[PDB]
Each structure stands twice: as C-alpha cells, then as structure tokens.
Amino acid sequence: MKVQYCDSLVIGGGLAGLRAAVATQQKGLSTIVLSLIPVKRSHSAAAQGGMQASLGNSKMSDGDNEDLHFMDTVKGSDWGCDQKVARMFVNTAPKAIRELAAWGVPWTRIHKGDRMAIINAQKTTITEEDFRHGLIHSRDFGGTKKWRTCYTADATGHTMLFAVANECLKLGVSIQDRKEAIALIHQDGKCYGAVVRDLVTGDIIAYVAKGTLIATGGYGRIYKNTTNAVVCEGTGTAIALETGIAQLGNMEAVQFHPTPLFPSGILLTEGCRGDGGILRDVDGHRFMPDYEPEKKELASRDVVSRRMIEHIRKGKGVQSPYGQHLWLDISILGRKHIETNLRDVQEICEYFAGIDPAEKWAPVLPMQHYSMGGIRTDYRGEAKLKGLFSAGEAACWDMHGFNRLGGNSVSEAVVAGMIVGEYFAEHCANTQVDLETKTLEKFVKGQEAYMKSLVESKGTEDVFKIKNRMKDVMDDNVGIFRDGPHLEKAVKELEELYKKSKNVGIKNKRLHANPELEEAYRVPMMLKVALCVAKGALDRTESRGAHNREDYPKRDDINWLNRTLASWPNPEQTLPTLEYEALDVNEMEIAPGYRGYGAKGNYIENPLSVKRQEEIDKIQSELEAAGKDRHAIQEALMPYELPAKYKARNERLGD
Amino acid sequence: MTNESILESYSGVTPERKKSRMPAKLDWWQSATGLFLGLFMIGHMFFVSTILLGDNVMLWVTKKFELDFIFEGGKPIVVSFLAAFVFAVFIAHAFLAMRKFPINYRQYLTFKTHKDLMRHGDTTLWWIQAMTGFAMFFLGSVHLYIMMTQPQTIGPVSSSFRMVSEWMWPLYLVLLFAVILHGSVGLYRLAVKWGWFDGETPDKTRANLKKLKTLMSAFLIVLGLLTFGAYVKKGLEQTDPNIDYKYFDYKRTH
C-alpha cells in the first residue's frame, strides 16, 4: 500500500488552497497541496473584474470602510449569509490586498490628476489628489456605490494566483499536480485524509494528515453553458458529500453572469455594460430601457439576466444553431475607447468569436458563473466531519447567501485562505490523530476495487451522452427562472441519469492516463451534486437572491430565512437528504429588509425582523449619542471572531 | 592548474563561493571577435572591389596598405601582419562560436527536425550561420594563409593571375556567399542580441534591421559577383607565357 503523510493536506491549488497552504507551512507544519492540474492554471487565474476591498484610497473610494462593504455584502446576499462571517471577511479583505501587494502583485496605482470617467449618472471627470498618488487604485465594479474593486490591469486573478503559488514554492510547500482526490478517509466522524488517484500512473494512494482542507472551486460544469473552466465539476464537493457526514449548504444558490460570449461561454467582463455597452435583440432593438427605464442596461446583473431571458421568451431572441442568444453592442463606445480600455475584450471576440467588437456585435446569453453553495462549515471553516475544512468557492462559509457580490469571490478565496488557514493550522498542530491501517486499507482497497469494476463493466451506457444529458437538464430546468413543475421533471430525470451512469462501459481498458476512466467515476459524482442543486431548488418554495421561483415570486422571510443542508447518509439512496439551518435574526447586525435591486415589498416580512430592527435602532442611538465609535457600536450589535493575527484595525488614508 | 582552478573544478564555484565570470567573458569575446570580422568584411568587400574602377585604383589601394606613404614602394610585409592579425581573430572567433554547434546525433536530429517544422526565419538563419561558419574552417583558412605569405602578389594583374591560373575562383566563389551570409546575419543577430538599437519600439527596430540585413547581403553579393567577374576576365586574358603575372605588380616599385 502507498501512504503519504503530511500534517496539513490541501485538496485544491487555487487561491484559497494555496493561501491556506502558506498559512500552515509558514508555521512548521509539513503541508501537501493536491491538484488536478498545475496550480497556477486554476480557474482563479481567469478573474479579470477585480478584488473587492475597502481601502478607501481613490477619490471614488474615499469614505469607504468595513461597514459600507459589510452592508453591500449582506443586503447583496438577500440575508442568506452568516453576517458574522461577512464581518470577518470585510475586515480582513484590506489586509489581504496589502499582503499580496507586499508579495509583488502589480496592483494598478493611482496617479495625481483628472481622468475621463464614466458614472453614467454623470459621465463626468474625476480628480485624484496628490496624497493619493502611488496608492492602490480601485474601479467601479459589482454595483457598489463605493468604488472598491482593486485590480492588476486586466489580469487580476492571474497575478494574484501567481504570487500565492510562488510563496508556496518559497516556503517549500509540496505541490503535487495531476493528482485527484476521489474519496475522503474518515472513521468515528473524523477526517484522516484522502484516497488519491494519480492521473498519470493510475496509482491509488492514501494521503493521511491531521487535518484536511478542500478548496476545490465551483461545480459550474454541471450546466451546459458556464463561464467555468472544464475542471470545475464539483468532485471536491462530491467526495465530501459521499462521506455521509459532511453537509452541503445552499447548493441551489447558483449565480449567473449576463454577458458571456455565446456559445463558448468565454467571459466578456462587466466593464462592457458599465462603459456603455448596449444590449440588443433580434431586430437590433435596445430593449433594456423597455424593462428598466431608469437604470436601463446599468441595472444590477441579477436584473439584466432576468430581462434578457424574458425578452428571449417573448420571442425576440436570435436564432442560432446552438440555441437562442442576444447581442452585445460595444461598437458605439468608439474604436479608440475599446483599443485602450477594453483592448482585452477586443481580443476575446476576435480569437473566439471571429469578430471585431468595434465593428460587429457579440453574441451573448446569461450562463452559470459562480457557486454560492458548497461544503457547509462553521466560522472557522470546519465541516460537520471533524478535521475536514473547506475554503473558497468550494465552501459555504457563507458570506454570500443567495447572491455573492461581484469582486467578493476572489476576495473570499484569499481572505478565507488566511482566516481558515489560521484555524486549520491551529487544528493540525493541536489535534492528535489515531491512524488505523485497517481503515486506510479499507478505503484504498475500496477505490482500487471500484476502478477495476469500472474498467470491467459490460454496461452499454455511454459516459459522455449521460454527462451531456445532465448538463442540458440543468440548463433547461435549473437556470435563471425556475418553477415547481419543471424542477420535478429535472429531479426525476437526474435520478434516472444517475442510475444509468452505473451501467457505463468504457472502451479503453488501461488504468493509467485514461481520460475515459476519469469520466467514468466523475460523472456519477457530478450527478449526485446536480441532484442537490435541483432537488434543493425544488424544495425551496420562495424567490431569494439568485434563486427565482416563478411560482413563488416573493422572498419568504417567515418560512425560508434558513439554509439548505444536503447530505447523503445512505450510499444506497438515490436522492439527497435535505435539512434546514435557521438563520437567527437576533444574531444579525442588519435585520432583513429591502435589498436595493428589483421589485419592492416583494418579501413576506418576518415579525421578528421588526422587533430586532428596533433593538438595533435603540442600541445604536444610545451609544451613538453617548459618543461611541462605529467599532464599539458594531461590537454591541453583533460580536464576531478573528484569529489573533488578523484582529488589528485597517489603517486608511485620512486617519 | 592552480589551486583556485582545482577548487573551482571540484566545488563548482570560485574560492569566494561565487560562480565563475568566465562564461561572461567568453560570451563577450565571441561577440567582439564576431563583430570585428563582421566590420572587416564590409570594408574588405569595398577595397577588393576597387578593380571595377580600373587597375590604377586597385594598384593604388594595394600600395597604400603596404604603407606606400612611408616606404619606398611600400613594404608588402605590412600586409603579412595585417593578415596574421585577422587570421588570429578568425581562429579565436571560430574557437568560441564553435561551442554553439549542435554536437551529437540527438542535438542535430532534433534541431534539424524542429527547424523544418518551425519554418521560422531567424531560427533557420542560425542554421545557415552554423553551416557557413563550419564551411569557412576550410575555405577561410586557405585564403588567409596566402595573403599572409604572398602579400607582394596582390594587384590587378597578380590577383587576376591567382584567381584564374591558380584556380582560386571556385573557392572564392563559394567563400563569397558563405562569409557574406554568415557575416550579415551575424551582424543582424549581434544587434538584436545586445539590443543596442532597441529603443521604445524594439519590434519596429528589429523589423528594420531585418530589411537592412537582407539589403546588405544582396548588395555585397552583387558587388562581390561583379568584382569576381572582373578578376576572372583579366586572368583569362593573361596568355603570354613570357610574362610573369604572379609577380608582375610587385615588379614595378619593388
């Protein structure tokens, strides 16, 4: 038997995984990072919008602080997030930027002077003072009133990921790629590591550690149309769910982006709309104003996506051999504006769409983008399965609720990596584990048996046809608009698809470098993941954040101010087991109210919200009058935790 | 062998635990010698082509190198040194550049395959550099020893005699194409390797240097082919068996 031991095992080499690996290595814990591919190729590298953090450096950032950021995040989540976690987040975000800055991340800087700026509420000019010069800049992104999205030109994710990966190399972390975690080792409700398959040799190896962290990214590829990389299939989520102990949180909370290139799904940054981009239909008609006379194509993403789908349903969509789409017209911004400010958008359309965005229109359509759902954890990042932690998009640390804020996901990866990294490091150093060879042997022989059975199956089903059918079902039934009747149809079919997936047969019989065999065990996992999203989408009879139930348009704060928890305790069952974790309003710093975007009074008000609201107004006013800083007031409304290391306040310009 | 060289050989570093600077010096000299031979050939192509302007010019040039304006009819021995110096540099440059040749079956195979696959200009040109350079080991050595040991036999008549009656034209013909392709490409590469003229638009600069490279080659080839024919014809017109053409030019002013 092959066994590898390390104090801290990290599954996932993206921003969250690598940063967490830094936190454990820097304090003497031997740590291994497992990854499907070279770590600096993770989906994190694709980020081009930026990272949200309240620095308050630039003119449009002036006045910004933890409180403002915190609020956008909570109201953005539609109150489905753990506000305490959101506080831990907003507070640490500033120091994540600065640390990355200290590590070489080439953040775009501010320079004294006036500049051409688009506010589309006034496409006026902005002035940056001299004392702001040389500090980290920010851009308008995510719809926040305060511009706090930091960026490194148009390759933010790229540079960020490279810095963290390089720190890992500097600290001597063990990066092992082309290695896939296919199962978690656990006994008596504690995680002891993972059974891993070497994608090249095909060897099944047991990786044991005192603590295991899953930072496997999103499960976006369970949809046919998605912005995600081809490696975001949620298997990380799956192996956690397959322990029968750990739970998945809000898997039905999937977020879509409105303007990905159709049909490839290659992202066309939000800056297109923000700078003036125009959405047109089959007739070339600018339709957003029709639906949103005020904000027009500058409405919140959530809205735009819905409108685009509505318009298409009204039969005004473009007919294409890959389906219906709409048009994105950026040409009206001028050629000089594109070749300098959107020089990267011009390359995307040429290389992949075969068009010049300054001369032609780009085919677009909303598609799956971010996964709010994930392995459920406490504020420390630990799952119900002791010793198993999760961070980043793969988790449901839950600071996103039902709508993650644009710019908050890459931010969360690094931040959670820092905070969970600490808690994880502490767990590993302090906990003491009892490793039984009998158990290691059970899990390793177990997966060897499984691989063998796959290679020997005489089943007649095709893994690809099964996989493709799954992504169609998800796209057609679990997208932007959902209704009970269709969800039931989807759940039923996904469950049937799951059963047939076990009668798959593959042509290639080898155990090493076998892409066909990879699909063989992955698709079944992807199906169990899809079932949690679909079935959870069916059972949640309300419309919250990204979850829109046509048959239940109003957000139900009475019966649904909770969190969906999925599990699969019985390996023989064919549908996920759902439970709910109620969000206690009494622990909220901000009581459930209007979110800012969309219809109004579109929510069944919960009576305890009002009571709590007063409690808030009361306590706030008394201290606010008694001469008290925003800090003391915050502590009085909702005290949160933070590792000692990140407890410090964030110095800002104008302090 | 010195202790330091023993220590460096066995430790991989200098006695101060630093990497040798030899590689740096070696790299420098390879370019320096390459640059010298490069410029030398440009000039050489002109001063040798003066015969297109009449024997009086050619003869005038020939005499000045022998330091005409300092000695009687000029001491040819001057050219002997001038040649010895170029020969040495020639040797040194070959010795240093030689390090860059593919040097075994695998290297040769994989690089040749790659070149044909790539169909990439600057890569293909380097192959030419390697080839021509290797060819000159033989071609260049011949010419250099004669000029060095028979300086008094340079002239419109004498040179034309060797060119034809001594069968140098075949060698000369080939060496002409060799040294010019080698030298001009080597100069072009020398420029982009050190980036002397990069500036703010290196891409534009490089593009120019490439056109420049080609032009220089064409010119020198045409000029060289003309000068070639010149020497050839004259030699072919030296029919009198009573005339000593080899030393005819020398036998004018001692």
């Binding site: 994540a96 600065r98 892409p515 | 040798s20 740096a24 696959l117 790539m118 890569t123 390797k193 050190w194």
Partner: protein, 239 residues
Amino acid sequence: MGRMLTIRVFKYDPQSAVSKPHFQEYKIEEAPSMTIFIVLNMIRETYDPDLNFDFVCRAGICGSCGMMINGRPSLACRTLTKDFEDGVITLLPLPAFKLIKDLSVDTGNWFNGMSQRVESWIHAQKEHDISKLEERIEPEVAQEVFELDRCIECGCCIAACGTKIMREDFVGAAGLNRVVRFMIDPHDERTDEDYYELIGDDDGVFGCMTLLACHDVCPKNLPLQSKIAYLRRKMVSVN
C-alpha cells in the same frame, strides 16, 4: 457540410510496452468559429476517447493547451481551424517537455522547477505590515512589472526554442523573463550580482543563442527580444 478537415494526431503511450509512436487521422467537418479545443473534444466524445490532451480555461488564459499546430507551438483553445487553407491540421505534443501521452506533456512541473531555480518570489529584508498603508509605487512602474508578470507559463517559448531543444538545462525564455520581472520590481532587493548567481552561466543567459522563436510565438506578446537583451547587457557587466 463546413468542409472536411483532416486531423493528423501524434499518439504514443510511453507507459505501455506495446505502444509505438505513430500518427492517427480523423475526419472532422468544420463549423463556425471552430477551434482546436472544439475539435479535440469532438474526437474524444465520438471517435477516440483514448486521445490525451490538457485543456482548462479554453479561453487562452491558463496556458494549458500548448501544442505544436502545424510546426508552431501555440495554444489549442485559441486556434481556429478556419485559418488553415488546406483543411489539414497536424498536432504534436510540445517538444522539450516530458511527454505523458499523446498531446499531453508535463509543463507544470518543469515551470515550478524553473520558478525555484530563479527564486521567483519577492526578496525583501523587512516584512511590511499588512494593516498599514501599502508602500507607494509609481503607476508606470506597476504597469511595467505587470507586463512581464503576464506570462502564463504556457511553455510555447520553451518548445519553440531550438537551443533548449538541444541543451535541456537551458533555463529558457520564460525563465529569463521571470528574472527581469523581479529585477525591475522595487519590492525586490536583489542586485545584479545576486541575479548573476542565478542565471550567470552557460545554462543561463549566456546559453541563449538569440533564435528569437520565443518572441515570435509568445501568445501574450511579451517583450522577450528586448528584455532578454537587457538582461544580457547587465549580466555581462558583473564584476
């Protein structure tokens, strides 16, 4: 029909004793905006699920799909069949990298090695405080470091480099570029002598023969040509 494309693919499984290097052809019908990414996946799911290849972002960002497309190292996902007036496309795995199988090579581990070799990380004595104002940097300086930091380790400049094909210990274009990326970064305190101890030898900067193939195939159009030259001048002046 979109026109029949003849797809010639290099196949070889070094881990199998019965496998031998050979080519295999597939007949694919061209489609609109068709890329090699689309093609390879078509072939996988319907003609031959044996074929190995690495794709991730499928958006020319990660540098995962580098391979030889008609003799030129380039990113598969960003390559359009439409650009081949012949309908005959030949695919080879990137040379100069350990071959896993077929079109799949190991670029990731070579790069991590290259990164360690050049100590690809900020070298500073004093650790700045992450709760205080970040140190100020001139926007122009930030822009420059960014330009070189854009490298996506696709491996195309390594595979395009004849020198590296012949002498495997050559640090390569990407490696030389990495040095300059830190050289011009104010945050990094290393001096020229420091960098000399890294790439100041025949396997380093002096091993470069200025073939420039790297500069001409780099999918991110990094200023390799001039930047390599910049580094050579500086390294030849140490001492």
